[PDB]
Amino acid sequence: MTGAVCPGSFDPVTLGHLDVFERAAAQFDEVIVAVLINAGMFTVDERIEMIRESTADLPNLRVESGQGLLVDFVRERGLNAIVKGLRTGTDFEYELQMAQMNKHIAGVDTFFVATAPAYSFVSSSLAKEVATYGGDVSALLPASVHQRLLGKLR
Amino acid sequence: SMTGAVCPGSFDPVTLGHLDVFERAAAQFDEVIVAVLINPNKAGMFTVDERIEMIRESTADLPNLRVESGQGLLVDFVRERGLNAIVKGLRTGTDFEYELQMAQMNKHIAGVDTFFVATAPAYSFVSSSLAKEVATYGGDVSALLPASVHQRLLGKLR
Amino acid sequence: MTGAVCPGSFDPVTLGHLDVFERAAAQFDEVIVAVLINPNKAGMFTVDERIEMIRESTADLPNLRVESGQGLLVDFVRERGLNAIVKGLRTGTDFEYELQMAQMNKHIAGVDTFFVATAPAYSFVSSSLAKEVATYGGDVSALLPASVHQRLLGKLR
Amino acid sequence: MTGAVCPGSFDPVTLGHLDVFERAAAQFDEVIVAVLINAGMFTVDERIEMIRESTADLPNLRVESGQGLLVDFVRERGLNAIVKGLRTGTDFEYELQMAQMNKHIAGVDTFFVATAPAYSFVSSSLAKEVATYGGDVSALLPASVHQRLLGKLR
Amino acid sequence: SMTGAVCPGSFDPVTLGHLDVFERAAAQFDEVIVAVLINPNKAGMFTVDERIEMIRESTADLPNLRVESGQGLLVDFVRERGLNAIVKGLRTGTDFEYELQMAQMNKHIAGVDTFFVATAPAYSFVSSSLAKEVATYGGDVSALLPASVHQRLLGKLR
Amino acid sequence: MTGAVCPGSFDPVTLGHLDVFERAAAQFDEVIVAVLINPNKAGMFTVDERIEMIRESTADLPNLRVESGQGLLVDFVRERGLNAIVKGLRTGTDFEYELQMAQMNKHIAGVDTFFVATAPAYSFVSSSLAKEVATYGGDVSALLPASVHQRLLGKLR
Numbered sequence: 024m025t026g027a028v029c030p031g032s033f034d035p036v037t038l039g040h041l042d043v044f045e046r047a048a049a050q051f052d053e054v055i056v057a058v059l060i061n062a063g064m065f066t067v068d069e070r071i072e073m074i075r076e077s078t079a080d081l082p083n084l085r086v087e088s089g090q091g092l093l094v095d096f097v098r099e100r101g102l103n104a105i106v107k108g109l110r111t112g113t114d115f116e117y118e119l120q121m122a123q124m125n126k127h128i129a130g131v132d133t134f135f136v137a138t139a140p141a142y143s144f145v146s147s148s149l150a151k152e153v154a155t156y157g158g159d160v161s162a163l164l165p166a167s168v169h170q171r172l173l174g175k176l177r
Numbered sequence: 178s179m180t181g182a183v184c185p186g187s188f189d190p191v192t193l194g195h196l197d198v199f200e201r202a203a204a205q206f207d208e209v210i211v212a213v214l215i216n217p218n219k220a221g222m223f224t225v226d227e228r229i230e231m232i233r234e235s236t237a238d239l240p241n242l243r244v245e246s247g248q249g250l251l252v253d254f255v256r257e258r259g260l261n262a263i264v265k266g267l268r269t270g271t272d273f274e275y276e277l278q279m280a281q282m283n284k285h286i287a288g289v290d291t292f293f294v295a296t297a298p299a300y301s302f303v304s305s306s307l308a309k310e311v312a313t314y315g316g317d318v319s320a321l322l323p324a325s326v327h328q329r330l331l332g333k334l335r
Numbered sequence: 336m337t338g339a340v341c342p343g344s345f346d347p348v349t350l351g352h353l354d355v356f357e358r359a360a361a362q363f364d365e366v367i368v369a370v371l372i373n374p375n376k377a378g379m380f381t382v383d384e385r386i387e388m389i390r391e392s393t394a395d396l397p398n399l400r401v402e403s404g405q406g407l408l409v410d411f412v413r414e415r416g417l418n419a420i421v422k423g424l425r426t427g428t429d430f431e432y433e434l435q436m437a438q439m440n441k442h443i444a445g446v447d448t449f450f451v452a453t454a455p456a457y458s459f460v461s462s463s464l465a466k467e468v469a470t471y472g473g474d475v476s477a478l479l480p481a482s483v484h485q486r487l488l489g490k491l492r
Numbered sequence: 493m494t495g496a497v498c499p500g501s502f503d504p505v506t507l508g509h510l511d512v513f514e515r516a517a518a519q520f521d522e523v524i525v526a527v528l529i530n531a532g533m534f535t536v537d538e539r540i541e542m543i544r545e546s547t548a549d550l551p552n553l554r555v556e557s558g559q560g561l562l563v564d565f566v567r568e569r570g571l572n573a574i575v576k577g578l579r580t581g582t583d584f585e586y587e588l589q590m591a592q593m594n595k596h597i598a599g600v601d602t603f604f605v606a607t608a609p610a611y612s613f614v615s616s617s618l619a620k621e622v623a624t625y626g627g628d629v630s631a632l633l634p635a636s637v638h639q640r641l642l643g644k645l646r
Numbered sequence: 647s648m649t650g651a652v653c654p655g656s657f658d659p660v661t662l663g664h665l666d667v668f669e670r671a672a673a674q675f676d677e678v679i680v681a682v683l684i685n686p687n688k689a690g691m692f693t694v695d696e697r698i699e700m701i702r703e704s705t706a707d708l709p710n711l712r713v714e715s716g717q718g719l720l721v722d723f724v725r726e727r728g729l730n731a732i733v734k735g736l737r738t739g740t741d742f743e744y745e746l747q748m749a750q751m752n753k754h755i756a757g758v759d760t761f762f763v764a765t766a767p768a769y770s771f772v773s774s775s776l777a778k779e780v781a782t783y784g785g786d787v788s789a790l791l792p793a794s795v796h797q798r799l800l801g802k803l804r
Numbered sequence: 805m806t807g808a809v810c811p812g813s814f815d816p817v818t819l820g821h822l823d824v825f826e827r828a829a830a831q832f833d834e835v836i837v838a839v840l841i842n843p844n845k846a847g848m849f850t851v852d853e854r855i856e857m858i859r860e861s862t863a864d865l866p867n868l869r870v871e872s873g874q875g876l877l878v879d880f881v882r883e884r885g886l887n888a889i890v891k892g893l894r895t896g897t898d899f900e901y902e903l904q905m906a907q908m909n910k911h912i913a914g915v916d917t918f919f920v921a922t923a924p925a926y927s928f929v930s931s932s933l934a935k936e937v938a939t940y941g942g943d944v945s946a947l948l949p950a951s952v953h954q955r956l957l958g959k960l961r
């Protein structure tokens with residue numbers, strides 16, 4: 024009965040995120056993608072849909088929204104592990120501070136894994152920015168997500 | 178002879194990480210001034226008087242440390258009090274590259290030195306901002322703050 | 336034939352920037368300083384002021400020119416028939432973010448980014464820190480070109 | 493049937509290592525501590541004994557020695573995950589390079605987890621050095637290990 | 647006008663990460679010299695001639711790039727050839743702080759500039775040393791090295 | 805009453821080190837430069853040479869003294885009734901390792917470590933890089949005190 028939570032705002036989910044989801048799904052019996060309710064581009068419902076569409080081939084993964092402390096989200100589902108992806112530009116020092124705080128207040132472990140090099144420079148924010156000015160980010164997002172992004176811009 | 182250093186911050190609220198730095202500064206310098214920043218824009222959770230009071234309660238055993246508020250250029254605060262050293266603490270999550278930039282700038286414009294000290298591992302992941310955030314949602318940060326600060330913090334959230 | 340673009344908001348240009356401009360001008364046949372303007376946030380200096388301050392402090396570099404733009408840097412670069420960006424490094428540079436942007440810029444447009452460390456004397460000035468220090472009276476005269484310093488004090492007063 | 497490998501030379505195992513072992517053991521069904529055969533202080537057999545003694549309360553953990561590529565060690569046991577601890581002084585950039593190489597050549601994922609703050613500054617090398625000159629490292633090593641270290645020095 | 651840069655290393659053997667840097671330098675400078683270090687102490691896997699040959703095969707499409715061996719101070723190699731720029735690549739695992747130190751030193755003693763460029767993500771985790779180590783134990787690094795280098799490497803291991 | 809120890813192998817002392825010595829001497833009542841010797845590896849300079857080069861370049865600091873030692877730094881510090889180390893930071897400093905050692909030193913002996921950044925002009929010299937550069941003829945005269953430079957060239961010849 025192993026399991027981990029993969030947190031984020033995912034506005035929108037990128038192939039970097041999906042790579043991490045797939046690795047978590049391959050190494051834990053159960054994975055929950057935790058979508059933060061927090062001024063963004065997609066609604067929570069749209070963000071969940073896009074992740075669900077992109078993870079249809081991962082039977083042991085589900086997608087849920089949440090608010091407040093991540094460790095409460097994790098513990099209320101009977102788990103005590105977080106899997107977080109690393110990419111170029113991740114503020115790792117801040118992630119370490121939060122990992123140590125999260126272990127202290129709730130006994131939740133955080134496992135970090137590097138995203139694949141091909142997806143190591145995409146972020147939700149940079150993808151939106153580049154797409155806004157007509158840059159081609161189609162190789163960096165799930166095909167579904169890419170078309171919905173184009174819709175939001177145009 | 179008379180040595181001295183300034184320990185700067187907003188301290189909203191003071192944490193055990195801050196206190197650890199205060200104690201080390203007070204042990205190594207004849208005089209220490211904790212400089213509490215007043216910021217006219219972003220008003221935090223505690224007033225400047227409340228922040229000073231919380232620092233004074235926490236540093237009651239440090240006779241050579243005093244607490245003062247201030248505004249503007251830190252190196253002016255320092256030099257106005259006849260000193261020319263700043264002691265700053267490092268924790269997990271400190272933007273150290275930015276701290277180094279500011280240290281080199283402060284040396285250049287006013288001849289003030291900056292000494293960095295790492296907080297104890299037990300207190301290395303607390304920050305004022307993260308403590309407030311965790312406490313707001315009912316997380317237990319009582320092991321990371323002075324006892325009286327924790328009491329006051331619970332009060333401000335109700 | 337060779338050429339590079341040196342990008343920034345330059346609000347105002349510092350001696351750190353000028354050091355990088357000079358090195359690029361010495362190593363490439365042409366250099367274009369790209370003054371990138373955000374149409375949705377005014378800086379301290381207008382575009383014409385920014386360009387004027389750069390021109391006055393680069394007058395001894397015959398192969399350097401200054402132009403403003405907005406939107407994607409790689410479009411600015413490519414529309415001028417170039418394929419290289421030269422970016423300075425200083426103390427406090429978010430290099431991980433710069434690397435992310437460099438890899439994205441190469442991916443979307445085939446543009447290369449070359450980083451160069453600014454001289455130690457100029458390694459701790461930034462436009463933002465110079466403005467902050469000068470706002471509260473600190474002496475930044477040694478860190479900014481003559482074309483900038485008193486104009487900066489002017490804006491603050 | 494989840495599982496991970498925790499690699500090292502462990503010469504000797506520290507409480508920082510043990511903290512990582514315990515977290516891996518809590519989050520994966522099976523954990524293998526992989527002890528490198530590589531000029532050190534303890535023999536491979538002694539290093540294994542010390543880890544086994546220190547992990548007696550972890551029923552799903554075993555300890556084995558090995559040589560050559562770590563990913564071959566991992567894959568030959570039917571697993572494809574490595575759990576590696578982080579401490580103050582870890583050369584993380586090099587660990588990331590190796591993680592990306594290991595994923596490329598064998599499809600093995602590497603999960604990084606920060607050791608507890610109390611154990612974040614001990615290393616096998618620094619513990620030996622300090623102990624050699626009479627420094628007290630008893631709070632940083634398993635009680636068994638500490639006494640055997642004293643034996644090797646005296 | 648005539649611009650130029652030197653790309654230094656031991657290249658034992660050259661990798662696709664190196665080649666990526668070579669290609670970018672050759673695209674941006676009128677002339678590029680790949681400088682192959684001879685070290686009298688630590689003799690690696692390939693002789694200097696073999697290393698030069700492997701680089702030349704890999705750079706056959708770069709007419710403005712040439713390969714030369716050298717010894718001693720890199721800035722002397724650079725200045726002796728009438729140049730004053732070095733182009734160095736960055737990958738995962740590069741000791742960048744040390745590279746910055748050396749760049750500032752090289753500017754100070756000889757007025758030589760150093761331009762850093764990040765290798766493509768696909769080639770960002772290969773290094774000469776790690777490629778040899780993985781290959782020695784039968785790992786497949788053929789996607790990370792030029793085709794002829796891979797062939798030669800398999801030969802040296804038998 | 806107050807005091808700090810400035811440790812290193814100082815083989816040879818650089819202007820980066822001297823900058824740190826001067827700042828410590830200005831901020832503490834006494835400063836001891838601790839020349840740490842490895843009995844199992846000879847450096848370029850003997851202990852007496854190292855100490856002599858430091859004394860000659862610190863003659864204008866009346867509250868600084870120079871002593872050699874070996875073994876645990878914290879024993880050197882504590883046996884002199886002190887409890888503070890002052891260590892310089894430069895470009896290329898392995899700060900993560902320095903932090904690890906600082907936390908260990910606090911744990912085993914209660915000794916505090918204060919880090920200070922050396923001046924930008926001296927931020928890229930190290931004993932090791934100065935020796936390497938000078939070995940192959942590079943000019944490091946501006947990075948080392950007069951007490952060192954020609955003695956260094958002497959050793960290399």
Ligand SMILES: O=C(O)c1cc2ccccc2cc1O
Pocket residue numbers: 030031032057058059060088089090091092093096
């Ligand atoms: O930082 C996050 O990504 C985050 C995601 C959450 C997702 C669901 C509930 C709480 C959450 C808290 C977070 O800090």
Ligand SMILES: O=C(O)c1cc2ccccc2cc1O
Pocket residue numbers: 185186187212213214215246247248249250251254
């Ligand atoms: O950044 C600070 O912590 C700071 C504190 C001050 C405290 C008193 C006066 C000026 C100050 C300036 C600062 O930048």
Ligand SMILES: O=C(O)c1cc2ccccc2cc1O
Pocket residue numbers: 499500501526527528529557558559560561562565
């Ligand atoms: O780096 C290691 O810690 C390591 C441990 C091993 C342990 C057993 C077999 C191979 C191994 C290879 C390694 O690189």
Ligand SMILES: O=C(O)c1cc2ccccc2cc1O
Pocket residue numbers: 654655656681682683684715716717718719720723
């Ligand atoms: O570090 C190097 O890669 C290096 C290469 C050289 C190549 C040719 C001549 C001198 C050289 C000096 C170096 O430090």
